[PDB]
């Protein structure tokens, strides 16, 4: 229905985003310039204050001090407080009105998972930009992998939850810097593995998790559960 118009939209968004980067780069230059000015100011004040303090009333010094405290520090304060981001933030705010939202992001994640399921694609192939045509181009981060795994999880696809969580963990092992909570990754991964019936592996992953978070309530309970049954 509105399908073909939506293609038109994504193309427009790609060009909009390029304009946002231009704006962002302008903001950066403005902040760099402001910071260079403050650094030179701080350097001057550093020299003045250091000299004045390592000294264990003269009207020249008194005038210079009164004026610096009363006047010069207020001008410095005004510069520190000066916002350089208005232009960038104004444009971003206007442009966001046309951005995809959380539902769109989830929709796209599901469409990727659907493609994977249809062509039986392996995760590393998807993640490392090894799908045909677009060769070695778009890469998924460890966090992207975790997110896809969690979408699979909400749909009760524990098989793909397992594959995506393991990909996230492999990328970390390979040295990817990331902010994902590896405990949480293991939390979902151990449950997905448990659901498919591999108790041995679920037990293993539970022990891995407890190394990282000894107080993890759910994992501690899972270990007692496994130790009860498996033993």
């Amino acid at each position: 229905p509105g399908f073909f118009t939506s293609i038109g939209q994504m193309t427009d968004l790609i060009h909009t985003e390029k304009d946002l980067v231009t704006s962002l780069k302008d903001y950066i230059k403005a902040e760099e310039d402001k910071l260079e000015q403050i650094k030179k100011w701080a350097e001057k004040l550093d020299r003045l204050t250091s000299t004045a303090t390592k000294d264990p009333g003269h009207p020249v010094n008194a005038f210079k001090l009164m004026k610096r405290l009363n006047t010069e520090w207020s001008e410095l304060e005004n510069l520190v407080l000066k916002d350089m981001s208005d232009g960038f933030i104004s444009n971003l705010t206007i442009q966001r009105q046309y951005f995809p939202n959380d539902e769109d992001q989830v929709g796209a994640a599901k469409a990727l998972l659907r493609l994977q399921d249809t062509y039986n694609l392996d995760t590393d192939t998807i993640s490392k930009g090894n799908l045909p045509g677009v060769k070695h181009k778009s890469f998924l981060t460890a966090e992207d992998c975790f997110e896809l795994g969690k979408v699979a999880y909400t749909e009760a696809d524990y098989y793909h939850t397992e594959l995506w969580m393991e990909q996230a963990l492999r990328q970390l092992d390979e040295g990817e810097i990331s902010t994902i909570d590896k405990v949480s990754v293991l939390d979902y991964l151990s449950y997905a593995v448990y659901q498919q019936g591999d108790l041995d592996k679920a037990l293993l992953l539970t022990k891995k998790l407890l190394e990282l978070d000894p107080e993890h309530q759910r994992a501690n309970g899972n270990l007692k559960y496994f130790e009860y049954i498996m033993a």
Binding site: S190, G221, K224
Partner: peptide
């Protein structure tokens, strides 16, 4: 008895 089985996170 043991704890309840692993719950979904």
């Amino acid at each position: 008895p043991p704890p309840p089985p692993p719950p979904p996170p």
